[PDB]
Amino acid sequence: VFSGDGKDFYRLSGNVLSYTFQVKINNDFNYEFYNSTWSYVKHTSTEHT
Amino acid sequence: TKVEHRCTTNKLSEKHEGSFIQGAEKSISLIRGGRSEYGAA
C-alpha cells in the first residue's frame, strides 16, 4: 500500500481485511471567562458647637 | 442676664463603582482528507 499520510510504501499482512490512511481530524474548543470588580466608599461626619 | 447660642450638623457621602465582564468562545471543526501536519494546522 502507498499510504500518503507518510509518503512511503508499506507491506500489509495477508490476514487484514483493510488498512487505510485517509485522515480525519476533529477539534473542539471551549473557553469561558468572567471577571468581576466592585468598589465602595462611605463617609460620615457629625458636628456641634 | 442669661444667653445661649448653639448649632449642629450631620453629613454623609457614598461612592460606588462596579464592573463585570463575561465571555464564552467555542469552536468545533472537522477535517477529512489531507495529511496530518497540515490538517492539524
Numbering used by the authors:
A (entry chain C): 146 to 194
B (entry chain B): 393 to 433
The authors write:
Soluble MAC (sMAC) is an immune activation complex that is formed from MAC assembly precursors released into plasma and scavenged by blood-based chaperones. In accordance with lower resolution studies, we find that C5b supports the assembly of complement proteins (C6, C7, C8, and C9) into an arc-like arrangement of MACPF domains. As the molecular weights of secreted clusterin and vitronectin are ~80 kDa and ~75 kDa, respectively, we attribute this excess to multiple copies of both these chaperones. These data confirm that sMAC is a heterogeneous assembly comprising a single copy of a conserved core complex (C5b6, C7, and C8) together with multiple copies of C9, clusterin and vitronectin in a mixture of stoichiometries.
Density for C5b was best resolved in our 2C9 sMAC map; therefore, we used this map for subsequent refinement steps in which density corresponding to the MACPF arc was subtracted. By focusing our alignment on C5b, we calculated a map with a resolution of 3.6 Å which enabled us to build a near complete atomic model for sMAC incorporated C7. In addition, we find that the Macroglobulin (MG) 4 and MG5 domains of C5b also move to accommodate C8 allowing a network of salt bridges between the loops of the C5b MG scaffold and the LDL domain of C8β. We next subtracted density for C5b6, C7, and C8 from the raw images. By then focusing refinement on the remaining C9, we were able to generate a map at 3.3 Å resolution in which density for both copies of C9 were clearly resolved.Fig. 4 sMAC traps an alternative conformation of C9.
